[PDB]
């Protein structure tokens, strides 16, 4: 029984999905340069918020109030769902202030992961044209990324095979 | 003697050789090497 209307922020937050995986050097500078230009060119009208916490557990049809208080000692009361739900409305006040905001979420790396939630944000896709250049792009960082390179390619094509729409 | 013997024969030699080099370029084995060269350059441009 999906409602005809859904509550969304008045102003769309912007989330940038990295080439392979966030939290790693190749993606981090791949995101950092765009973040700087958002700060500089649009200074005085854009506010940037970084959330280290997760955002993929944003559900609205699970229960009336899962873990309403921290003293219940419930499984979800002491879990991480408390702060994730508390950060959901944090975006809303920024949207009502008309000053543009982005989502520096370090956990989301795929568009549908944050598509069923009430955020429904603007997803910006930065991608390398081919996997061949990306592999040697990782090589430029150093031997540290060489330990972690293998899973950094599987995260890329899974995001690539997602339809452009 | 100079015009026919030296300048006219030099014209045919350049003509025949140039035709042969054009045909050699479009050989299957030679085209594949160029296609590898073109792809390798495209990577370098994007990587830069």
Curated annotation (Swiss-Prot), chain A:
Transmembrane segments: none
Residue span of region Mediates interaction with the alpha subunit: 29-165
Location in or out of the cell: Cytoplasm
Tissues where the protein occurs: Expressed mostly in brain, colon and ovary.
Assembly behavior: Component of a calcium channel complex consisting of a pore-forming alpha subunit (CACNA1C) and the ancillary subunits CACNB3 and CACNA2D1. The channel complex contains alpha, beta, gamma and delta subunits in a 1:1:1:1 ratio. Interacts with CACNA2D4. Interacts with FASLG. Interacts with CBARP; prevents the interaction of CACNB3 with the alpha subunit CACNA1C thereby negatively regulating the activity of the corresponding calcium channel.
UniProt record similarity statement: Belongs to the calcium channel beta subunit family.
Function in brief: Regulatory subunit of the voltage-gated calcium channel that gives rise to L-type calcium currents. Increases CACNA1B peak calcium current and shifts the voltage dependencies of channel activation and inactivation. Increases CACNA1C peak calcium current and shifts the voltage dependencies of channel activation and inactivation.
Protein name: Voltage-dependent L-type calcium channel subunit beta-3
Recorded name of the encoding gene: CACNB3
Shown residues in whole-protein numbering: 167 to 331 of 484
Curated annotation (Swiss-Prot), chain B:
Subcellular location, record wording: Cell membrane
Tissue: Brain specific; mainly found in cerebellum, cerebral cortex, thalamus and hypothalamus. Expressed in the small cell lung carcinoma cell line SCC-9. No expression in heart, kidney, liver or muscle. Purkinje cells contain predominantly P-type VSCC, the Q-type being a prominent calcium current in cerebellar granule cells.
Domain of life: Eukaryota
Disulfide bonds: none
Transmembrane portions of the chain: 1-18
Family listed: Belongs to the calcium channel alpha-1 subunit (TC 1.A.1.11) family. CACNA1A subfamily.
Known partners and oligomeric status: Voltage-dependent calcium channels are multisubunit complexes, consisting of alpha-1, alpha-2, beta and delta subunits in a 1:1:1:1 ratio. The channel activity is directed by the pore-forming and voltage-sensitive alpha-1 subunit. In many cases, this subunit is sufficient to generate voltage-sensitive calcium channel activity. The auxiliary subunits beta and alpha-2/delta linked by a disulfide bridge regulate the channel activity. Interacts (via C-terminal CDB motif) with CABP1 in the pre- and postsynaptic membranes. Interacts with the spider omega-agatoxin-IVA (AC P30288).
Domains (record comment): Each of the four internal repeats contains five hydrophobic transmembrane segments (S1, S2, S3, S5, S6) and one positively charged transmembrane segment (S4). S4 segments probably represent the voltage-sensor and are characterized by a series of positively charged amino acids at every third position.
Role played: Voltage-sensitive calcium channels (VSCC) mediate the entry of calcium ions into excitable cells and are also involved in a variety of calcium-dependent processes, including muscle contraction, hormone or neurotransmitter release, gene expression, cell motility, cell division and cell death. The isoform alpha-1A gives rise to P and/or Q-type calcium currents. P/Q-type calcium channels belong to the 'high-voltage activated' (HVA) group and are specifically blocked by the spider omega-agatoxin-IVA (AC P54282). They are however insensitive to dihydropyridines (DHP).
Protein name per UniProt: Voltage-dependent P/Q-type calcium channel subunit alpha-1A
Originating species: Homo sapiens
